[PDB]
């Protein structure tokens, strides 16, 4: 029972985020919930174009580079690449279908745009420092380690859309398919779209900022510059990004925007803790990964370590969520001077 | 079995633009189609935001325009504000789960962010000239006329989004549900997409035209200057859009992507033909209402039948249809100079 515009006039100011009334009409002069007019603004007004970046100096610094030093750089580029090829796609595919008001439906679009363009300046990047980028993006498939990664952060995505496609099919309750028992919940749902919110929050507030700090690690060191000037751009939009799933998330779990999501947000509390520790720990091995062959001057597994657990630990208080490690002082504060912005904060404060 | 990030390791460049393997890796170093990667190029080069116009004279026009002009402008506005309502999320919605090449996927996520501008410069205007945008925006819902073409139109959409989701959750072959026998066939999947987007090639191709030549009808009487700025703009991504969907059709017929879609095509061009004449006649019908209580200097509803058969014959021969009416002349070549841009050609040649 999807519809791209509902017939039914409604008040789109008391409609819920999420599952209620299709958004009929896109109209921009209120809102429900002003900060997302606010997020559109600021990443509408933060718009780039990766080619505007020189990064024809990075293909000289990568080939110097040494081996492992390769090995971290490419492991780095290939992830976040990655990472932002589900996030172009993905908001849109899993979100558009289930919002009910429309400053949330268009920061969702936004959203995804600004990620299609990271996309894309990771190209812009890739193409210009190897020979052959095929091979560098076929093994963003078939690696091993990128591959583990992939699979979880996509199944919470995958399973919000089979549960979501069900829901408009067959509506809540009991049914059969194919001599099959299919039981759509709409509390069920509600929990789903809860913890898929709650990886991308984590996605994007703590893993793409491990990634940042070793881009700017490279740039501490003279090196890839021109990489990083693009995750600087990067960056500022991330901040924006991880600054909206907080407000869902928190909208959500105060019940001032469902009541029934209040109760679902408590009951899966737990879930929700052991999902980001996962996520914390799964950077933790990664940071082993990149540095299985030596590490570089300033930027060590043992020092991107204790940058996981700070910044976990900052974003969880962020969500409501207990702290799952020791109270840390920032263990690269070298990396508040790119993670700046005057327009939106960018570092975690 | 829709997936956000396939595991598979295929080949971007082999696959069909739809219900291949769903798009992995986002690339932008290769092309099937390298059209798709010129139109987002092209897209972005235009990115602009409504509020670097000034619309504030535009308020003391529309204040003095007689009834009959106040209901022709203000029609036209929200017709357009209803189009690019559904515009706005319904390509991500419709097509983003069936695409599988990189190039298209991310053209239709910028395609569809680019008209989530235009509906807020549809706001931006409307909160501009009248005094209470509510009754405005709840119009668009509510409104006879306006009501009956966003359900055709709409329907385009909705059915081939219902039917996708049952092609996702239940794969090819008859089926059980709740007792019912539900045949998902991937054949008559491939044909819903073909009517859609040939009713969302109409739609740009020919509706918006219809409500560009109002507009700028407006603008040679030297009257909403504000408005006509940004449908000029709106006009240049238009032809963007429409340009996109005319490949996406032409190749889809031609066999050289699909050979199956070719015979698809080939055994619904007149359901596609009846398609067109049915939207020609819609704008023809919607003239009638514009013009019910006047008309206005250098614009009736003659003149604008007139152009809806002009401009209906040009877009059919686009995309391989017959031509439904006498061979004219353009009825208003003025429309030319505001149909114009040095970079993409805006006006119908």
Known sequence: ????????????????????????????????????????????????????????????????????????????????????????????????????????????????????????????????????????????????????????????????????????????????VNGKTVTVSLRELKKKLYLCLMSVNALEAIRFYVSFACSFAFAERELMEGNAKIIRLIARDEALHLTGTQHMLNLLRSGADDPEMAEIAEECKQECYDLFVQAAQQEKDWADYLFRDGSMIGLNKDILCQYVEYITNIRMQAVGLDLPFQTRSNPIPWINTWLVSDNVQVAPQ
């Open 1 to 176: 029972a999807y519809t791209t515009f509902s017939q039914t006039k409604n008040d789109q100011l008391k409609e819920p985020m999420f599952f209620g009334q299709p958004v009929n009409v896109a109209r921009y002069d209120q809102q429900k919930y002003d900060i997302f007019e606010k997020l559109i603004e600021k990443q509408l007004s933060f718009f780039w174009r990766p080619e505007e970046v020189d990064v024809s100096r990075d293909r000289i610094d990568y080939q110097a580079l040494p081996e492992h030093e390769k090995h971290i750089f490419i492991s780095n580029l290939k992830y976040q690449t990655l990472l932002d090829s589900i996030q172009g796609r993905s908001p849109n595919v899993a979100l558009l279908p289930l919002i009910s008001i429309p400053e949330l439906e268009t920061w969702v679009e936004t959203w995804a745009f600004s990620e299609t363009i990271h996309s894309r300046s990771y190209t812009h990047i890739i193409r210009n420092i190897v020979n052959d980028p095929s091979v560098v993006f076929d093994d963003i498939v078939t690696n091993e380690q990128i591959q583990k990664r992939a699979e979880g952060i996509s199944s919470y995505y995958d399973e919000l859309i089979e549960m979501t496609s069900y829901w408009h099919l067959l509506g809540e309750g009991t049914h059969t």
